[PDB]
Amino acid sequence: KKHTGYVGLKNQGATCYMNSLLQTLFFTNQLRKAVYMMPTEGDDSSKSVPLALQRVFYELQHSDKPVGTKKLTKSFGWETLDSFMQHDVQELCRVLLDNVENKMKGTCVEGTIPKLFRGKMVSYIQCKEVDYRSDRREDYYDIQLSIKGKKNIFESFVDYVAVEQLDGDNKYDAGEHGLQEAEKGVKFLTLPPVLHLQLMRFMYDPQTDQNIKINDRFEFPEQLPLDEFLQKTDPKDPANYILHAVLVHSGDNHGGHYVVYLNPKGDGKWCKFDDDVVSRCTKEEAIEHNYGGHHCTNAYMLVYIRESKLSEVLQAVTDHDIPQQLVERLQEEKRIE
Amino acid sequence: SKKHTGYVGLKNQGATCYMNSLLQTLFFTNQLRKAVYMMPTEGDDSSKSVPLALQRVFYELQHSDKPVGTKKLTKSFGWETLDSFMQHDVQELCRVLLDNVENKMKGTCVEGTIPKLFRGKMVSYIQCKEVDYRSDRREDYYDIQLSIKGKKNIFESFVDYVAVEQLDGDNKYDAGEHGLQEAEKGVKFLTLPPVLHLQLMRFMYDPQTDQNIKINDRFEFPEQLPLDEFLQKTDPKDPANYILHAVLVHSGDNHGGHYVVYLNPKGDGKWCKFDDDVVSRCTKEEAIEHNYGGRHCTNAYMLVYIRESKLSEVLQAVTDHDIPQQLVERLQEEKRIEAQKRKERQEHHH
Ligand SMILES: C[C@H](CC(=O)N1CCC(O)(Cn2cnc(NCCN3CCCC3)cc2=O)CC1)c1ccccc1
Ligand SMILES: C[C@H](CC(=O)N1CCC(O)(Cn2cnc(NCCN3CCCC3)cc2=O)CC1)c1ccccc1
């Protein structure tokens, strides 16, 4: 890792978006710190996702060589192309974040995943004719944005919190209060320190009974203000977000080219992670070059960090953060391996 | 206010002398503070546990906007009167505190933090000149006591620290079955730790007045302290270059004098004066030269240096994530119980 200071993951033909996601998660320093601190001494090295994740993260930080993922893929049972083909990227993220979240429960680092990744939203129904609502709170770890017909992220959030009028034919059934003229919608209460946006390029096609990739132009900013999509905003902490990672795909199928762009320290110093090969690149290469347009190349997932949280999220990782139990277990594995 | 400097003070609660100064010093040893928050004080008594009590002080220092109290802390290690403080040099309290938490860290993810941060290695020797005999005693140290009497600066104290003493004449060395021998006695530094705690020995027994008195002679200490020359063997990759982190100061002639501490917590030459509740930004000159000394009785008695190669690890940033929710909930719980004791104690009395 001589040129950038960052090491690659081995090209695995069978794993598609995984390398891109693992880098993105590794560079979420506070998650990596939590993960290192997880107590995993009495686990099976084949089968535990936490332990496999510790290994990958450890090796990504310390190895001079491209890091392998086979024990990781083994641990969560996605050991073939087909597993990746049948899951959106956020579902893999959930497989990973969920395993480590619930292993952190009752530990010194409990509550770290939700503190980093969990925002809150309400799905509401509001009858305009009589005062009956149906406010429904709900946690989220990621947001799936519509890009079809949308110029940019801003327009996707507008659409995301757009008002559907429930009138005439499709009035809201209030059950005991009958049919009601209402408006349906979603409001954000909070946005987390680390904001995972998936761009919904893969859409079902009635004409061919299949998912197809939309390669249309869709713009995302380096700096993303989000106060206007919140219910109540905070004066001391505006929802101003900083672009941290761009997960990119070239082509129209799972055999295409998966890379990830990252500015790991949050300083606009961008790197391209193309499996084992990691190289410095321009902001333009990481950002505008991946807006897409009409086999070719665009973003399908973005990671933003809340600007007020950058120093927490991207806290430097120190030897303190890796317990010797962990250093030694991983040494002992390599001892046999 | 914490609003001026970003740092909060410790309450002035009776005469605990040098404690507040030492507490702030240890708090801004970030790596230590992180380890402390990590100690499994799950079912510790709050009145008895020094580890828990320290976690409370460090936590309140990191989050309180008001001055932080130390009464449960003083109670936990049993120093509740002026005499407890008068019968201990500053390093003795530090040892009590570091040893408690060092022991509480045993079998935890943060075991060996205390020695990693504070433990250096030395050898004291006696070599016979005329005969082939040598006693060597390897020892760990967590602090160093420097002689200032007739020393201009730290460099001179260190020279004197490793100076060879000729055992000849009347005070010959007893070499066992070699009889008395001309010997020479000395101390060698093998290693210098990442955090270097230097006490300046201004408090010395005075025969004529049969008491310890404070010596207020001028004694100079650098911002940047090179120590390679005092190592038995140097390291080409990691020279013993030190950075002044803190200057613990005293004003007056006895334990009822004034204790403050100067600290540039980030190790960036940006200094604040910590005077109990009142923390204020100050000049580098107020911190360093103005505490050289030389009735002027305001001067440094203890210095904290951090090795330059370790600075960013010792002073690594502390965030909310470095405090387990379990600890935060536990310290909230103690606050409620103490709030209730305020009411309970007042009902008995009124
Ligand atoms: C052909 C590849 C397949 C792929 O690796 N991935 C599938 C799509 C991907 O998950 C991003 N994304 C995530 N959730 C979406 N939700 C709506 C549609 N899905 C629901 C069921 C399956 C499709 C839609 C979407 O687009 C990224 C990984 C691709 C498609 C589109 C963009 C890039 C690459
Ligand atoms: C009057 C105060 C008392 C005080 O709070 N302290 C006593 C001395 C202090 O502990 C620093 N220091 C530490 N180990 C020393 N060792 C030799 C003398 N001691 C041996 C047993 C007791 C005296 C000598 C010394 O000087 C700092 C706190 C004072 C005296 C001198 C400088 C500053 C303040």
Coordinates of C-alpha atoms and ligand atoms in Angstrom, one line a residue, chain A residues 16-17 84 87-91 144 198-204 211 213-214 249 252-254 258 298-300, ligand 1:
Chain A
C16 CA -19.8 -8.2 -7.6
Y17 CA -20.5 -5.2 -5.3
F84 CA -25.0 -11.5 -5.0
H87 CA -29.5 -9.3 -3.4
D88 CA -29.4 -5.5 -3.7
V89 CA -26.2 -4.0 -2.2
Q90 CA -28.1 -2.6 0.9
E91 CA -29.2 -6.2 1.7
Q144 CA -33.4 4.0 -1.7
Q198 CA -28.8 3.7 -3.0
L199 CA -29.7 5.0 -6.4
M200 CA -32.4 2.8 -7.8
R201 CA -30.9 2.1 -11.3
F202 CA -32.0 -1.6 -11.3
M203 CA -35.8 -1.6 -12.1
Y204 CA -38.3 -4.2 -13.0
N211 CA -34.7 -6.2 -13.9
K213 CA -30.2 -1.2 -15.3
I214 CA -31.2 2.4 -16.1
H249 CA -20.8 0.0 -11.9
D252 CA -25.8 -3.5 -17.5
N253 CA -25.3 -6.8 -15.7
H254 CA -23.6 -8.5 -12.7
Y258 CA -17.5 -2.7 -9.9
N298 CA -22.3 5.4 -13.1
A299 CA -23.0 5.6 -9.4
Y300 CA -25.5 3.2 -7.8
Ligands
LIG1 C1 -26.8 -5.0 -12.9 C2 -26.1 -4.5 -11.6 C3 -26.6 -5.4 -10.5 C4 -26.0 -5.0 -9.1 O1 -24.9 -5.3 -8.9 N1 -26.7 -4.3 -8.1 C5 -28.2 -4.2 -8.1 C6 -28.7 -2.7 -7.9 C7 -28.0 -2.1 -6.7 O2 -28.5 -2.9 -5.6 C8 -28.6 -0.6 -6.5 N2 -30.0 -0.7 -6.2 C9 -30.5 -1.1 -5.0 N3 -31.7 -1.2 -4.7 C10 -32.8 -1.0 -5.8 N4 -34.1 -1.3 -5.4 C11 -35.2 -1.5 -6.3 C12 -35.0 -2.7 -7.2 N5 -34.6 -3.9 -6.6 C13 -35.6 -4.6 -5.8 C14 -35.5 -6.1 -6.0 C15 -34.2 -6.3 -6.9 C16 -34.2 -4.9 -7.6 C17 -32.4 -0.7 -7.0 C18 -30.9 -0.5 -7.3 O3 -30.6 -0.2 -8.4 C19 -26.5 -2.2 -6.7 C20 -26.1 -3.6 -7.0 C21 -26.4 -3.0 -11.3 C22 -27.7 -2.5 -11.5 C23 -27.9 -1.1 -11.2 C24 -26.8 -0.3 -10.7 C25 -25.6 -0.9 -10.6 C26 -25.4 -2.2 -10.9

